[PDB]
Design a protein around this ligand. Structure first.
Ligand SMILES: CC(=O)N[C@@H]1[C@@H](O)[C@@H](O)[C@@H](CO)O[C@@H]1O
Ligand SMILES: CC(=O)N[C@@H]1[C@@H](O)[C@@H](O)[C@@H](CO)O[C@H]1O
Ligand SMILES: [Ca+2]
Ligand SMILES: [Ca+2]
Ligand SMILES: [Ca+2]
Ligand SMILES: [Ca+2]
Ligand SMILES: [Ca+2]
Ligand SMILES: [Ca+2]
Lengths: 140, 140
């Protein structure tokens, strides 16, 4: 494959899991920092556009990490409450919200993440929460 | 594949043909300019390590370009006359010099290039000469 070292190939993308508990905001900033303008490579929190991509991302994550917990993804509704969008600017199609989610619990949940159960069913969580994270390269 | 837009994939690498006449020196700089330090991607003039890579590069070039002329590659003997090496630090195994080449013509030819004939058989040319050029990404 043609992925940078320490990134994994799948389809037209590269992915990299970071086994560090941090905030969504910091995970987002970390992923974006790998970007490279000279090749128009965007690095960003992972966006998910199919069941296949969901399964790949989840299976990659849980192949390395077996702790109970969550995995930040690039979905958020910070700018317009209830309207979830991807940080990489790609259009939302596929969704996999867990039962009862999203719920904007305590009016402070704007940041998307996989649960470790139900094949990575999604939850919205707060700016104070911690989770692991996953970056994705997009060749723009 | 996982190559950047406007680059082509083959094996563990990406390649990109630039259909513009320029000097070897400028071609070298142009190719290195596509490097991405955050992803440990080194871009350089193409190095050629087998008959397969030779044919891939030649056929890629000649898929686009109909003109008689040459294609700069990363081979040079600028720093040690008569010992051609790759700018990307990979070792010279495979060679495909044209008959009568290299000849260090007028004591001034230190830069490698494919001819548009004989499957891209190589010639050494001067710092004043012009050719098209091909870059290559190496994921270090
Ligand atoms: C393009 C090409 O192969 N050019 C060469 C050149 O480098 C020099 O070797 C010369 C010797 O008469 O013959 C050819 O012109
Ligand atoms: C990790 C996770 O899913 N946490 C949620 C949380 O965001 C909140 O929605 C809550 C509402 O009771 O329930 C949980 O299941
Ligand atoms: Ca909000
Ligand atoms: Ca919200
Ligand atoms: Ca929630
Ligand atoms: Ca010389
Ligand atoms: Ca020479
Ligand atoms: Ca020559």
């Amino acid at each position: 494959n043609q992925c940078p070292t320490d990134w994994e190939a799948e389809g037209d993308h590269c992915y990299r899991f970071f086994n560090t508990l941090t905030t969504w905001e910091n995970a987002h900033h970390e992923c974006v920092s790998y970007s490279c303008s000279t090749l128009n490579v965007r690095s960003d929190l992972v966006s998910v556009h199919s069941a296949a991509e969901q399964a790949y991302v989840f299976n990659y994550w849980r192949g390395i990490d077996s702790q109970a917990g969550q995995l930040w993804i690039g979905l958020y509704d910070k700018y317009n409450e209830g309207d979830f969008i991807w940080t990489d600017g790609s259009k939302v199609g596929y969704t996999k919200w867990a039962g009862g989610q999203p719920d904007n619990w305590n009016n402070a949940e704007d940041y998307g993440q996989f649960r470790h159960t139900e094949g990575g069913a999604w939850n919205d969580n707060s700016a104070a929460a911690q989770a692991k994270y996953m970056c994705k390269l997009t060749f723009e």
